Amino acid sequence: AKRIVGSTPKQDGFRMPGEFEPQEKVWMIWPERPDNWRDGGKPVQEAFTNVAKAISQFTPMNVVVSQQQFQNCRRQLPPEITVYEMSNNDAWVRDCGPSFVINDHGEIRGVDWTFNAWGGLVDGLYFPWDQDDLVAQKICEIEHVDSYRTDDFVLEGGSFHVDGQGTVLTTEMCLLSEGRNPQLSKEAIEQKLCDYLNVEKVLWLGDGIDPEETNGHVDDVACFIAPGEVACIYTEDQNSPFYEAAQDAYQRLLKMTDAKGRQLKVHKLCCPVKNVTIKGSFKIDFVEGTMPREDGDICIASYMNFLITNDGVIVPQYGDENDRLALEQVQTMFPDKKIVGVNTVEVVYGGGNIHCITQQEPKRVGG
Amino acid sequence: MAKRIVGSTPKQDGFRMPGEFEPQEKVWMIWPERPDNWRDGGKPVQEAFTNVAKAISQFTPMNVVVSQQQFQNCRRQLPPEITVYEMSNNDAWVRDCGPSFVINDHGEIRGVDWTFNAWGGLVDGLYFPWDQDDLVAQKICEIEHVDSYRTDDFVLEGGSFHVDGQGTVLTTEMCLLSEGRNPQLSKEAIEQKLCDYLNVEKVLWLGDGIDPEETNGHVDDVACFIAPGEVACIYTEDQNSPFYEAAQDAYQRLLKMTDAKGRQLKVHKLCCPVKNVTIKGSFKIDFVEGTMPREDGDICIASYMNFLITNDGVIVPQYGDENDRLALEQVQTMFPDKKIVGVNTVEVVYGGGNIHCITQQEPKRVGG
Amino acid sequence: AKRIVGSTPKQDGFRMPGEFEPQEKVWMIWPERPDNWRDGGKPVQEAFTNVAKAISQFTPMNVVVSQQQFQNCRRQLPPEITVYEMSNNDAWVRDCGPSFVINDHGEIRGVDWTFNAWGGLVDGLYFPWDQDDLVAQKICEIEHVDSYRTDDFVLEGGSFHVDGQGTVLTTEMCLLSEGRNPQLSKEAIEQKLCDYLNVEKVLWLGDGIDPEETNGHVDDVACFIAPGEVACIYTEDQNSPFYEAAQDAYQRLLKMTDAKGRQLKVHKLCCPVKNVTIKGSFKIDFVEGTMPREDGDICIASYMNFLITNDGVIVPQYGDENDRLALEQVQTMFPDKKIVGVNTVEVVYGGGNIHCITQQEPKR
Amino acid sequence: AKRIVGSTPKQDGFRMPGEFEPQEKVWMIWPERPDNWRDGGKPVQEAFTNVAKAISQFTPMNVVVSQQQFQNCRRQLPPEITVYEMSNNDAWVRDCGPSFVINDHGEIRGVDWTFNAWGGLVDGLYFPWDQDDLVAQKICEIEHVDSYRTDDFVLEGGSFHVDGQGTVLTTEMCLLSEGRNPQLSKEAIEQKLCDYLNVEKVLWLGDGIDPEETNGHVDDVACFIAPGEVACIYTEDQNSPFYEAAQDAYQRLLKMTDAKGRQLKVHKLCCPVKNVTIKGSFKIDFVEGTMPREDGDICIASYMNFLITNDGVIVPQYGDENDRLALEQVQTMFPDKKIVGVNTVEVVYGGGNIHCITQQEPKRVG
């Protein structure tokens, strides 16, 4: 496939569709690095396998994997899930994957953002990320899709959410941080989102809930369920580490309008009652430069980190008293979809969840 | 997708390997680099594979698979219409470690994943290990969402046989009956594997090939099918040629052979280079114990027979020999309605083979 | 360093000393491969760390480790243990390491045997083993030691034991097996041992206790405690998978004399009462070509697989009722040494134990 | 071995000795990466082999090499040269190697600076450099030597020169560039050099000659031949790419005194008459993020990039008319040493020379 040079998605008539628009397939990277994942990734591999299986009932599923894990990965996953060899540094394809864009006429392209492991050498989560940064192009090659590379602009798919109708929702905590694009003004960043997502309105939330991990990705806080409709985390437990950020996001969203002038309909999503924490007993390597996983570390367990995929919604389950409530709430957001909970506490120990380990590929429409 | 198909054979399941002259959906190639085979860290041969890939792409969608380290360079070198995948490998001979695709009459396609052992394993193979090469067939099948048969404990390479798509396979005794392949099997057991996995009824045995030390005499340097009932065979009257005895004998055998449908084979002569191609001397190639040495004066297996038939084109070796044009003329007469493209591939021949051995076709589904 | 070509240790005046002779250093490879070791090697890395620590009290200790695990390995091990990067396929340096030989005139060389993962493509335990087979040379380079490469002769250090005085002890089950040197007669194999160890008498035991794993390495069955003195595993439990082999080894040893004509003194060593087994809950990858680790598999848990190292002896502990008895018995074999038990059941799940995961380097 | 934490070389009584002080051994990395080195590194491997061979006549020599190249490397090098497997991203051990320091009492330690491929993500020469950055510690482990790690302080051995007597010589162009330690002032950087080298006086030259490559490493411009004596490149060819910087370095050195108050004696060293250039016909991969090697690129061919090693001095030879003159001049700087020229144009295509591909290890004294 080819790089598209000298033009933007917007100029070329391509847009990032909403995650709730029809999907051709879904992508995932197989997890393994022992300085993030306990027990050499054996527990988290089971969780990713379960997520992959859940998605595959709704949408063709694909997993990419290192040279060393290829044979095990192919054995673990059912044959209807396609497996590719692909080098990688960690397994977060929401964030190092391509963001696909489509036009009105049956074509699809990829946006290949610069990836830097959530803050690079300022506050990134490991070093290096050179193989992660090639995942977007390799997936586009597989798909025979041409791509835009955003030179000198760092972004992750998990840091924004689109409605497919001219709006993007994001967080100041993430995009304005020192480790991302520190030379750019907020206005310059807005222009990049407009140009590459094909949007005209940027909705800024303030804080996210994981300042140390992704620097507050919006996908743990709020998302679009449909045009003009958002879900937002909510809690009234003032002891929650998520309390202030959930409260502020909720209040901001109530009065936001999208690009079409619709006042957002905000649907509350609960949070886990109890903190999910790293235990010192977890067998995780310490490596200088890799984010430590220390006893008592509070993990970012948000139910918002779900994947919408065709007729299904794949929702985190953390072993919390609110697991059932979360499924009930998401069901009401998507009354005509099948809601599937998957036990993903093993994913959350590594810094994210179902949404951060997947990347959808939309169906081409038109032509 | 890829499941393995277990407890049955292609023949039992109504699949057959089509002739290489039947319509193709795609062609595959591995990007070359290993410095104990390829001089100058593969730079000269990478240019040659690029030219071969470009030539194929004019006729048939083209695909190259490449190591982690060479991915970025490979993608830069190849035009964008050629798709590039990361794929681990030990060397770049996808005719031999690739899958052999088979089709049925209902529009389906499956892969045959043979056991690969680097042309003789620890008996007389060309390097060690070959564990990544041996996974290429499954990985390409995965990319294609194609289910595959794995031939447990049976070693074979795609370059070691040729099929007419109509019940016949052509092969060499020098290769398939050698100690480093399947020494526990009788000739009859080996015939059965060919019949079951290719869907053939008649195995035509040539004797010697022309590269006993390299592939143990792959048929694809000696003779191939141009169409059902029609073969091409190398030919020389130079008794000083290292190819002479094997060329003369293959030719004589073929003139006495009938295919599975009882047709007397029509044999078309293909010339050989007048001058030997040799390793120099001055080539910068690493020596590693266990890897086939490339020593000054080594005669390289330069056969014009190692061409690829691909849809409306035929891609033919050119060695810088006086017979390069004659070879193109002869191939044109074999395929009067195809476009014949010569590509300078002497840099590939230094590494032990040529255009046919660095490619693997994927047939179109029919029925389908 | 240089390869020594056209001669053998015996011709050049070098011999492999007994393991009970003084040692300069000990070597170990860091374990990790997930199709042998459960939980991506985390539990076994703790056991190897504990073994390395125990050895370091007696003898300078060295661990070699893959690119990916180097940083973790260096963090886990105390600083007195030296850490080198070294590619490898699995972590059994007794078997893919060099066997060092000395001339008792200040010089030392290595024997670099051909390694094939305990049976190659016939019955080996994984494929490939190309990096394992380079370990012996790389360790010799580190030590500035010249080496003899035994072209077309496959051997592992764990398959034989020497007294340093002209005798070697081995098993027919291992050395005569199809996956090792099937082209060679028993007598030709004897001659290779004589040439490369500098011995004159080969003592052949019959069966080992792990036919499927190493093909019956002697180092799980019997060893030399001192010149003229051996220890042999023993059990009276006819339900033991070790029963017949232990019984025959013991009976053979009672009838053997060494190269100096000494009747061997034969001490019995207990065996674990209960079988150690792979559990179904163990999280181990399956890969075609790699020895499967399946529920109920009996693991080769022998107390014989101990390392003699200067003033210490490092002895397996399996969590078995006989763990303390084993330490008692080894103490009586080496009355002037410190006997240290280490919990090594995690190592045994992967097919061997303390002796297999170490390689000594003798003092010059 | 151990990391030394909570103290510096200076506090602990360790100093970096001059390169002209006795050496136990020398280190080198084996080159191969095809997006720097033409022909998959075959020509440059021959050059590194020749450099290693020359050094070995004076001082025991050691080469470290990738998994893939180990067997070829061991075959190419004579057996007296010890070969170790060691992962790396490129082959510039002067710069990613440890800088050894010694005390007066028979001990040696290593300083392990942060390495970032000569400017990191600002203007570094490739990405990533994670394996390069582990070379210093792995070499220290081989040697059983304890090391100081300079957290958050980036430095390369080729960016400074010491006299072993309290002075360090360096360049503003390199140490003060954005891609190195931009949060640190000049004064903060001086303090790090003083603490880690055990020096009291930092002599700042201005420009180096390779702003795009190493950002002007001092070891292409000037070095110490002995306490109180320096060599400095010199040319009167105004068309020379090295003219302005050679002229300015020379003038600054003429005004400089060392940490012991000695007026520096400055010895001129010629520069090549003709520019060494990359040819478009060189077969070198282009990779976004790796310094391109384009037709007509002027290579940094300095005769200053020589290695002093015990009784020998190993001097670049570029195939230039001034090759002999360079040997004559270095001979007069070291009248009692054996001067050995080695053809190293294949090294210079990749951005440096003999000094940048070696790292000495001093003899323990006392």
mmCIF file of C-alpha atoms in Angstrom, chain A residues 82-314:
data_model
loop_
_atom_site.group_PDB
_atom_site.id
_atom_site.type_symbol
_atom_site.label_atom_id
_atom_site.label_comp_id
_atom_site.label_asym_id
_atom_site.label_seq_id
_atom_site.Cartn_x
_atom_site.Cartn_y
_atom_site.Cartn_z
ATOM 1 C CA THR A 82 -6.883 -15.050 12.270
ATOM 2 C CA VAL A 83 -3.315 -14.830 13.612
ATOM 3 C CA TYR A 84 -0.481 -12.763 12.098
ATOM 4 C CA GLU A 85 3.155 -12.455 13.099
ATOM 5 C CA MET A 86 3.928 -8.831 14.003
ATOM 6 C CA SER A 87 6.681 -7.402 16.194
ATOM 7 C CA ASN A 88 5.520 -5.173 19.015
ATOM 8 C CA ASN A 89 6.716 -3.777 22.353
ATOM 9 C CA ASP A 90 3.414 -4.143 24.250
ATOM 10 C CA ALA A 91 -0.171 -5.145 23.499
ATOM 11 C CA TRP A 92 -2.263 -1.956 23.297
ATOM 12 C CA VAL A 93 -3.520 -1.749 19.702
ATOM 13 C CA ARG A 94 -6.178 0.892 20.547
ATOM 14 C CA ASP A 95 -3.242 3.216 21.048
ATOM 15 C CA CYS A 96 -0.556 2.140 18.597
ATOM 16 C CA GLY A 97 -2.949 0.846 15.958
ATOM 17 C CA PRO A 98 -4.150 2.787 12.919
ATOM 18 C CA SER A 99 -7.262 4.937 13.244
ATOM 19 C CA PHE A 100 -9.296 4.018 10.157
ATOM 20 C CA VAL A 101 -11.136 6.636 8.137
ATOM 21 C CA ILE A 102 -13.716 6.117 5.370
ATOM 22 C CA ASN A 103 -15.271 8.181 2.601
ATOM 23 C CA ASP A 104 -18.744 8.194 1.055
ATOM 24 C CA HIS A 105 -17.769 5.918 -1.794
ATOM 25 C CA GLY A 106 -16.476 2.593 -0.564
ATOM 26 C CA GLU A 107 -12.907 3.530 0.221
ATOM 27 C CA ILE A 108 -10.987 3.265 3.493
ATOM 28 C CA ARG A 109 -7.623 4.691 4.622
ATOM 29 C CA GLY A 110 -5.654 4.598 7.882
ATOM 30 C CA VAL A 111 -4.283 7.367 10.048
ATOM 31 C CA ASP A 112 -0.870 6.398 11.385
ATOM 32 C CA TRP A 113 -0.176 8.689 14.330
ATOM 33 C CA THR A 114 3.254 9.003 15.892
ATOM 34 C CA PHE A 115 3.267 6.635 18.904
ATOM 35 C CA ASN A 116 5.564 7.192 21.877
ATOM 36 C CA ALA A 117 4.401 4.804 24.655
ATOM 37 C CA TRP A 118 2.204 7.453 26.343
ATOM 38 C CA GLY A 119 4.774 10.177 26.948
ATOM 39 C CA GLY A 120 8.060 9.006 25.433
ATOM 40 C CA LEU A 121 11.150 9.859 27.429
ATOM 41 C CA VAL A 122 9.291 12.442 29.515
ATOM 42 C CA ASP A 123 6.778 10.113 31.171
ATOM 43 C CA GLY A 124 6.247 7.135 28.836
ATOM 44 C CA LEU A 125 5.638 3.607 30.124
ATOM 45 C CA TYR A 126 8.602 1.743 28.614
ATOM 46 C CA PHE A 127 11.481 2.217 26.198
ATOM 47 C CA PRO A 128 11.702 1.574 23.252
ATOM 48 C CA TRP A 129 8.441 1.608 21.271
ATOM 49 C CA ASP A 130 9.887 1.366 17.739
ATOM 50 C CA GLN A 131 8.076 -1.864 16.942
ATOM 51 C CA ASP A 132 4.768 -0.587 18.415
ATOM 52 C CA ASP A 133 5.130 2.452 16.131
ATOM 53 C CA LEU A 134 5.182 0.182 13.029
ATOM 54 C CA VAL A 135 1.957 -1.741 13.913
ATOM 55 C CA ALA A 136 -0.273 0.857 12.244
ATOM 56 C CA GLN A 137 1.521 0.566 8.883
ATOM 57 C CA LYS A 138 1.735 -3.251 9.035
ATOM 58 C CA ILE A 139 -2.007 -3.601 9.718
ATOM 59 C CA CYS A 140 -2.724 -1.164 6.841
ATOM 60 C CA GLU A 141 -0.471 -3.285 4.546
ATOM 61 C CA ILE A 142 -2.411 -6.457 5.512
ATOM 62 C CA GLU A 143 -5.630 -4.647 4.584
ATOM 63 C CA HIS A 144 -4.151 -3.113 1.360
ATOM 64 C CA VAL A 145 -4.997 0.260 2.848
ATOM 65 C CA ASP A 146 -3.207 3.537 2.108
ATOM 66 C CA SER A 147 -2.290 5.608 5.141
ATOM 67 C CA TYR A 148 -1.565 9.137 6.363
ATOM 68 C CA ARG A 149 1.445 9.403 8.662
ATOM 69 C CA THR A 150 1.273 12.353 11.099
ATOM 70 C CA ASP A 151 4.925 13.397 11.159
ATOM 71 C CA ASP A 152 6.010 14.894 14.460
ATOM 72 C CA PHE A 153 2.503 14.605 15.919
ATOM 73 C CA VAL A 154 1.972 12.086 18.728
ATOM 74 C CA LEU A 155 -1.508 10.653 19.373
ATOM 75 C CA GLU A 156 -3.201 7.439 20.534
ATOM 76 C CA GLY A 157 -6.608 6.184 19.448
ATOM 77 C CA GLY A 158 -7.642 5.809 23.133
ATOM 78 C CA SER A 159 -7.163 9.550 23.755
ATOM 79 C CA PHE A 160 -10.175 10.704 21.731
ATOM 80 C CA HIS A 161 -13.698 9.578 20.801
ATOM 81 C CA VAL A 162 -15.618 10.553 17.681
ATOM 82 C CA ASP A 163 -19.338 10.632 16.843
ATOM 83 C CA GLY A 164 -18.712 10.339 13.061
ATOM 84 C CA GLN A 165 -20.690 13.577 12.610
ATOM 85 C CA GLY A 166 -18.118 16.308 13.074
ATOM 86 C CA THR A 167 -17.292 16.054 16.816
ATOM 87 C CA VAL A 168 -14.364 14.721 18.839
ATOM 88 C CA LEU A 169 -14.270 14.396 22.627
ATOM 89 C CA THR A 170 -10.886 14.363 24.421
ATOM 90 C CA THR A 171 -9.044 15.378 27.624
ATOM 91 C CA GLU A 172 -6.715 18.295 28.375
ATOM 92 C CA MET A 173 -4.807 16.124 30.844
ATOM 93 C CA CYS A 174 -3.645 13.873 28.008
ATOM 94 C CA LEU A 175 -3.262 15.998 24.861
ATOM 95 C CA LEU A 176 -1.759 19.078 26.582
ATOM 96 C CA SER A 177 0.812 17.077 28.577
ATOM 97 C CA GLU A 178 4.588 17.627 28.358
ATOM 98 C CA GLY A 179 5.307 14.093 27.018
ATOM 99 C CA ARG A 180 3.016 14.394 23.976
ATOM 100 C CA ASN A 181 3.235 17.477 21.719
ATOM 101 C CA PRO A 182 4.622 20.094 24.091
ATOM 102 C CA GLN A 183 5.608 22.580 21.316
ATOM 103 C CA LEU A 184 2.003 22.827 20.104
ATOM 104 C CA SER A 185 -0.679 25.200 21.320
ATOM 105 C CA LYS A 186 -4.127 23.854 22.153
ATOM 106 C CA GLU A 187 -5.297 25.473 18.871
ATOM 107 C CA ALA A 188 -2.586 23.676 16.849
ATOM 108 C CA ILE A 189 -3.643 20.349 18.406
ATOM 109 C CA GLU A 190 -7.311 21.097 17.615
ATOM 110 C CA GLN A 191 -6.358 21.665 13.952
ATOM 111 C CA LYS A 192 -4.595 18.290 13.743
ATOM 112 C CA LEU A 193 -7.730 16.527 15.125
ATOM 113 C CA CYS A 194 -9.975 18.394 12.749
ATOM 114 C CA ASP A 195 -7.759 17.651 9.762
ATOM 115 C CA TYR A 196 -7.165 13.969 10.476
ATOM 116 C CA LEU A 197 -10.474 12.841 11.988
ATOM 117 C CA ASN A 198 -12.545 15.150 9.747
ATOM 118 C CA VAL A 199 -14.196 17.050 12.620
ATOM 119 C CA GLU A 200 -15.143 20.669 13.256
ATOM 120 C CA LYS A 201 -15.732 20.704 17.023
ATOM 121 C CA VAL A 202 -13.323 19.591 19.762
ATOM 122 C CA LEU A 203 -14.940 18.988 23.120
ATOM 123 C CA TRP A 204 -12.391 19.281 25.932
ATOM 124 C CA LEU A 205 -12.853 17.437 29.149
ATOM 125 C CA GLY A 206 -10.270 18.360 31.818
ATOM 126 C CA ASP A 207 -8.840 15.510 33.895
ATOM 127 C CA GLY A 208 -8.845 11.823 33.076
ATOM 128 C CA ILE A 209 -8.608 9.162 35.801
ATOM 129 C CA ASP A 210 -5.127 7.706 35.099
ATOM 130 C CA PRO A 211 -2.645 10.594 35.201
ATOM 131 C CA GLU A 212 0.364 8.275 35.661
ATOM 132 C CA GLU A 213 -0.568 5.679 33.069
ATOM 133 C CA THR A 214 -1.967 7.159 29.826
ATOM 134 C CA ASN A 215 -2.161 10.720 31.239
ATOM 135 C CA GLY A 216 -5.972 10.534 31.429
ATOM 136 C CA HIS A 217 -7.262 8.908 28.246
ATOM 137 C CA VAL A 218 -10.855 9.850 27.538
ATOM 138 C CA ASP A 219 -11.759 6.170 26.882
ATOM 139 C CA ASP A 220 -11.739 5.467 30.650
ATOM 140 C CA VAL A 221 -14.046 8.450 31.282
ATOM 141 C CA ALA A 222 -16.634 8.985 28.533
ATOM 142 C CA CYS A 223 -17.566 7.821 25.037
ATOM 143 C CA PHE A 224 -20.190 8.254 22.301
ATOM 144 C CA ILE A 225 -22.960 5.689 22.339
ATOM 145 C CA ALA A 226 -24.674 7.215 19.278
ATOM 146 C CA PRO A 227 -24.726 10.655 17.608
ATOM 147 C CA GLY A 228 -25.709 13.193 20.297
ATOM 148 C CA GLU A 229 -25.424 10.578 23.101
ATOM 149 C CA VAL A 230 -22.540 9.955 25.506
ATOM 150 C CA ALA A 231 -21.819 7.624 28.430
ATOM 151 C CA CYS A 232 -19.943 9.084 31.399
ATOM 152 C CA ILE A 233 -18.485 7.465 34.514
ATOM 153 C CA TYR A 234 -20.149 8.495 37.764
ATOM 154 C CA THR A 235 -19.671 7.919 41.477
ATOM 155 C CA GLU A 236 -20.721 9.689 44.661
ATOM 156 C CA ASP A 237 -17.986 8.016 46.724
ATOM 157 C CA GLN A 238 -15.736 10.953 47.640
ATOM 158 C CA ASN A 239 -13.007 8.482 48.631
ATOM 159 C CA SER A 240 -12.817 7.125 45.085
ATOM 160 C CA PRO A 241 -9.652 8.030 43.233
ATOM 161 C CA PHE A 242 -12.022 8.746 40.284
ATOM 162 C CA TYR A 243 -14.373 11.055 42.214
ATOM 163 C CA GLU A 244 -13.253 14.571 41.177
ATOM 164 C CA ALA A 245 -12.592 13.685 37.526
ATOM 165 C CA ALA A 246 -15.902 11.769 37.139
ATOM 166 C CA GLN A 247 -17.833 14.654 38.709
ATOM 167 C CA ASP A 248 -16.197 17.319 36.532
ATOM 168 C CA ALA A 249 -16.577 15.319 33.306
ATOM 169 C CA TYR A 250 -20.239 14.704 34.058
ATOM 170 C CA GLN A 251 -20.981 18.379 34.751
ATOM 171 C CA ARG A 252 -19.098 19.494 31.596
ATOM 172 C CA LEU A 253 -20.899 16.973 29.344
ATOM 173 C CA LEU A 254 -24.372 18.031 30.486
ATOM 174 C CA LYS A 255 -23.920 21.455 28.845
ATOM 175 C CA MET A 256 -21.862 20.452 25.822
ATOM 176 C CA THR A 257 -23.269 20.532 22.306
ATOM 177 C CA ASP A 258 -21.902 18.495 19.440
ATOM 178 C CA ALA A 259 -21.030 19.781 15.931
ATOM 179 C CA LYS A 260 -24.716 19.526 14.920
ATOM 180 C CA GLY A 261 -25.836 21.619 17.920
ATOM 181 C CA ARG A 262 -27.381 18.751 19.859
ATOM 182 C CA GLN A 263 -27.164 19.059 23.614
ATOM 183 C CA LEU A 264 -25.506 15.805 24.653
ATOM 184 C CA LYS A 265 -27.704 13.178 26.277
ATOM 185 C CA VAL A 266 -25.485 11.901 29.104
ATOM 186 C CA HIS A 267 -25.937 8.343 30.393
ATOM 187 C CA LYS A 268 -24.275 7.486 33.749
ATOM 188 C CA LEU A 269 -22.074 4.434 34.036
ATOM 189 C CA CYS A 270 -21.132 3.155 37.510
ATOM 190 C CA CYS A 271 -17.575 2.609 38.811
ATOM 191 C CA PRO A 272 -16.243 -0.366 40.825
ATOM 192 C CA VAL A 273 -17.074 -0.043 44.547
ATOM 193 C CA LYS A 274 -13.654 -1.398 45.577
ATOM 194 C CA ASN A 275 -10.233 -0.435 44.228
ATOM 195 C CA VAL A 276 -8.484 -3.041 42.100
ATOM 196 C CA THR A 277 -4.831 -3.067 43.247
ATOM 197 C CA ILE A 278 -1.464 -4.577 42.370
ATOM 198 C CA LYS A 279 -0.312 -7.113 44.939
ATOM 199 C CA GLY A 280 3.383 -7.332 45.868
ATOM 200 C CA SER A 281 3.031 -11.102 45.385
ATOM 201 C CA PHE A 282 2.543 -10.583 41.602
ATOM 202 C CA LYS A 283 5.552 -11.953 39.712
ATOM 203 C CA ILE A 284 6.390 -8.952 37.484
ATOM 204 C CA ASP A 285 9.926 -7.965 36.466
ATOM 205 C CA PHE A 286 11.277 -4.550 37.483
ATOM 206 C CA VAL A 287 13.180 -2.792 34.689
ATOM 207 C CA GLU A 288 14.388 0.813 35.016
ATOM 208 C CA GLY A 289 12.379 2.787 32.468
ATOM 209 C CA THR A 290 9.368 0.475 32.558
ATOM 210 C CA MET A 291 6.420 1.617 34.685
ATOM 211 C CA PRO A 292 6.753 -0.200 38.010
ATOM 212 C CA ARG A 293 3.910 -2.403 39.271
ATOM 213 C CA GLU A 294 4.160 -2.093 43.040
ATOM 214 C CA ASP A 295 2.118 -3.438 45.948
ATOM 215 C CA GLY A 296 -0.966 -1.314 46.546
ATOM 216 C CA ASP A 297 -0.851 0.487 43.189
ATOM 217 C CA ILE A 298 -4.431 1.424 42.328
ATOM 218 C CA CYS A 299 -5.370 0.017 38.899
ATOM 219 C CA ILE A 300 -7.558 2.007 36.514
ATOM 220 C CA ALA A 301 -10.610 -0.174 36.598
ATOM 221 C CA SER A 302 -13.269 1.624 34.564
ATOM 222 C CA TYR A 303 -16.366 0.024 33.068
ATOM 223 C CA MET A 304 -16.232 2.729 30.339
ATOM 224 C CA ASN A 305 -13.342 0.865 28.676
ATOM 225 C CA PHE A 306 -15.738 -1.281 26.606
ATOM 226 C CA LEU A 307 -15.771 -2.053 22.907
ATOM 227 C CA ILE A 308 -18.796 -1.396 20.725
ATOM 228 C CA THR A 309 -18.705 -3.895 17.865
ATOM 229 C CA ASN A 310 -21.629 -4.365 15.429
ATOM 230 C CA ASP A 311 -24.489 -6.116 17.320
ATOM 231 C CA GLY A 312 -22.355 -6.550 20.450
ATOM 232 C CA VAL A 313 -20.851 -4.576 23.310
ATOM 233 C CA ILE A 314 -17.912 -6.158 25.166
#
